[PDB]
Amino acid sequence: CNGLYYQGSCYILHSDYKSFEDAKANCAAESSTLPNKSDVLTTWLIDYVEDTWGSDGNPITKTTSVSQEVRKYFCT
Amino acid sequence: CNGLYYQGSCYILHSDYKSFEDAKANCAAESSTLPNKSDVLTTWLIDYVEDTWGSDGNPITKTTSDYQDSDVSQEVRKYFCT
Amino acid sequence: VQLQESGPGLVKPSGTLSLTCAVSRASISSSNWWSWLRQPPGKGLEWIGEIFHSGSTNYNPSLRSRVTISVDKSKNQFSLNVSSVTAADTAVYYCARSQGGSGLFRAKWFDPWGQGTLVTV
Amino acid sequence: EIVLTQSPGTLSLSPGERATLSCRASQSVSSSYLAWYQHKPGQAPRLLMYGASSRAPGTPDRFSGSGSGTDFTLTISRLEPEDFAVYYCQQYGSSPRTFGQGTKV
């Protein structure tokens, strides 16, 4: 496909910077959703998906042991 | 493959920050070269490849010409290796 | 992310001016490129470099030689030393943050600034 | 080093006006990547817009931005006493990030 690939899942980059709710709406329009943290943490995909929105509502990251932000969002 | 793919050429990211010479050295040691701006300009890859190194020695951008006159050699930037 | 700048106001010519900023409400180890900027009195602003939690530093080519930016994770402070001052460096130095740095999607624009200390050579 | 010039050095007005601030670049800026800022004297500078046409959260809708390549512009449809201050252009498509001269109101 046009984007990254993992376990038969295609991830498309929407470079436009947008909040979590606009990202959810845009993904819903595409019929897809935001990536889940579980599927990306244990993969090289993480290097691409870091600081991009996830379904949980917080930015995806490997750390840790807001609606006021806008960040580039993937869509699967 | 473990990265982006376009027209049979597969580009793997390298998260480490390194200068142009080190990036080229790593790409060559990994049987690969730095991405060519010619093939990446129009295609979607640019969205992922912006602000990464290229063969010409300058960060890849969507500008058609007029490369950065100011020196960028002594700078750090993530790189893709085919 | 509250950023507060603190440093010596007076640095005589040719000396090293060290300005240290404190990261609050977040972690310096987080995915953010911490940059320092300059505002000469009455003239346009500049960008005198950036740093990351790994120590990687990318400078302005004009000011690359003089400046050196460092990070101390224990005290969550990213500091900047400007050496060989030429008396033209007087300005309100600003701390800055640029989202990203761990991934490939760095956002250059410096959203959270910080009150800048004015240094007079 | 893309040199950004802001044409109106000072656009003096009384409250209420379609104020227009413009700034041009020596070379084309990639993706119209220009994020304006705000500078209330003493107060911490803010991020009014990113991408030259998008408003960061916390700034009202009266700020509308448009531009491409050489020419970029910000517009205030109506003015309030708490929304007049210095303004800046910031291009981040060149290796050295270059700002622009202030445009006081």
Q: How do the domains of chain B map onto residue ranges?
A: 4-81
Q: For residue A49, how far is the Cα from the chain centroid?
A: 6
A12 contact B CB<8A: no
What is the spatial distance between Cα D67 and Cα C70, in angstroms, rounded to a whole number? 37
| DSSP structure string for B15-68 | EEEE-HHHHHHHHHHTT--PPPHHHHSSSTHHHHHTTS--TTSS---S-SS---
Does C56 fall in a domain?
yes
* Tokens at B3, concatenated: 């990265």
What is the spatial distance between Cα C26 and Cα C34, in angstroms, rounded to a whole number? 12
Given an 8 Å threshold on Cβ–Cβ distance, is C94 in contact with D99?
no
Given an 8 Å threshold on Cβ–Cβ distance, is A15 in contact with B47?
yes
* Closest residue of chain A to B11, computed from CA coordinates: A4
Does C84 fall in a domain?
yes
What is the spatial distance between Cα C117 and Cα C5, in angstroms, rounded to a whole number? 6
Number of domains in chain D: 1
Residue C52 belongs to a domain with what CATH number?
A: 2.60.40.10
Which CATH fold would you assign to the domain A4-75? Mannose-Binding Protein A; Chain A (3.10.100)
Residues in chain D: 105
Chain B residues touching residue D93 (CB < 8 angstroms): 61, 63
What are residue D37's DSSP bridge partners?
A: D47, D88
Cited resolution, angstroms: 3.2
- Locate the DSSP E strands across chain D: 4-6, 19-25, 37-39, 46-47, 49-50, 54-55, 63-68, 71-76, 86-88, 90-91, 98-99
Which chains border D (3 or more CB–CB pairs < 8 Å)?
A, B, C
Q: Enumerate residues 6+ apart whose C-beta is below 8 A from C18.
A: C7, C8, C79, C80, C81
**What is the distance in angstroms between the Cα of A4 and the nearest Cα belonging to chain B?**
6
Question: How would you class C17 by CB atoms within 10 Å of its CB: exposed for 0-12, middle for 13-18, buried for 19 or more?
Answer: buried
For tokens 């950065």, the residue is: B68
What is the spatial distance between Cα C99 and Cα C111, in angstroms, rounded to a whole number? 8
Identify the CA nearest to A58 among candidates A45, A71, A47: A71
What is the spatial distance between Cα C31 and Cα A43, in angstroms, rounded to a whole number? 18
Q: Are D99 and C47 contacting, i.e. CB atoms less than 8 angstroms apart?
A: yes
Does D62 fall in a domain?
yes
Q: For residue A8, how far is the Cα from the chain centroid?
A: 16
Identify the CA nearest to B57 among candidates B81, B74, B40, B41: B74
What is the spatial distance between Cα C72 and Cα C55, in angstroms, rounded to a whole number? 9
Number of domains in chain C: 1
Does C121 fall in a domain?
no
Q: How many CB atoms lie within 10 A of CB B42?
A: 9
Identify the CA nearest to B80 among candidates B14, B10, B6: B14
What's the CA dihedral at B13, B16, B21, B27 to 10 degrees? -30
What is the spatial distance between Cα C90 and Cα C9, in angstroms, rounded to a whole number? 10
Instruction: Please list the helix, strand and coil fractions of chain A in percent, rounded to the nearest 5, in that order.
Output: 30, 25, 45
What is the spatial distance between Cα D18 and Cα D42, in angstroms, rounded to a whole number? 26
Residue span of the structural domain in which C38 resides: 2-108
Which chains border C (3 or more CB–CB pairs < 8 Å)?
A, B, D
Which chains border A (3 or more CB–CB pairs < 8 Å)?
B, C, D
Class for the domain spanning B4-81: alpha beta
Q: How many CB atoms lie within 10 A of CB A65?
A: 3
Give the CA distances from residue A31 to residues A3, A24, A27, B75, C47, in Å, rounded to whole numbers and listed in that order.
16, 10, 6, 41, 42
What is the spatial distance between Cα C58 and Cα B51, in angstroms, rounded to a whole number? 13
* Closest residue of chain D to B65, computed from CA coordinates: D28
Q: Are C37 and D98 contacting, i.e. CB atoms less than 8 angstroms apart?
A: no
Calculate ∠ Cα C46-D31-D33, nearest 5°.
30
Q: Enumerate residues 6+ apart whose C-beta is below 8 A from D100.
A: C44, D4, D5, D6, D23, D88, D89, D90
Report the SS3 class of residue C7.
coil
For tokens 């449809």, the residue is: D77
Does C44 fall in a domain?
yes
Identify the CA nearest to A54 among candidates A32, A31, A70, A33: A33
Q: Report which residue type is found at C57.
A: T
Question: How would you class B44 by CB atoms within 10 Å of its CB: exposed for 0-12, middle for 13-18, buried for 19 or more?
Answer: middle
- Given phi > 0 = left and psi -120 to 50 = alpha, else beta, which region is D72? beta
Does C113 fall in a domain?
no
B49 φ, ψ (degrees, to nearest 5): -100, -5
Q: How many CB atoms lie within 10 A of CB C15?
A: 14
Identify the CA nearest to B78 among candidates B3, B9, B20: B20
Does C41 fall in a domain?
yes
Q: Report which residue type is found at B9.
A: S
Chain D residues touching residue C106 (CB < 8 angstroms): none
Alpha helices, H only, A1-76: 20-30, 37-41, 45-49
What's the CA dihedral at C119, D2, D3, D9 to 10 degrees? -90
Does D104 fall in a domain?
no
Q: For residue B53, how far is the Cα from the chain centroid?
A: 3
DSSP secondary structure letter of residue A38: H
| DSSP structure string for C56-91 | -EE--TTTTTTEEEEEETTTTEEEEEE-S--S---E
Given an 8 Å threshold on Cβ–Cβ distance, is A70 in contact with D57?
yes
Residue span of the structural domain in which D51 resides: 4-99
Chain C residues touching residue B35 (CB < 8 angstroms): none
Q: Are A46 and A63 contacting, i.e. CB atoms less than 8 angstroms apart?
A: no
A48 φ, ψ (degrees, to nearest 5): -90, -30
**What is the distance in angstroms between the Cα of D72 and the nearest Cα belonging to chain B?**
16
Identify the CA nearest to C8 among candidates C121, C96, C109: C121
What is the spatial distance between Cα D84 and Cα D13, in angstroms, rounded to a whole number? 9
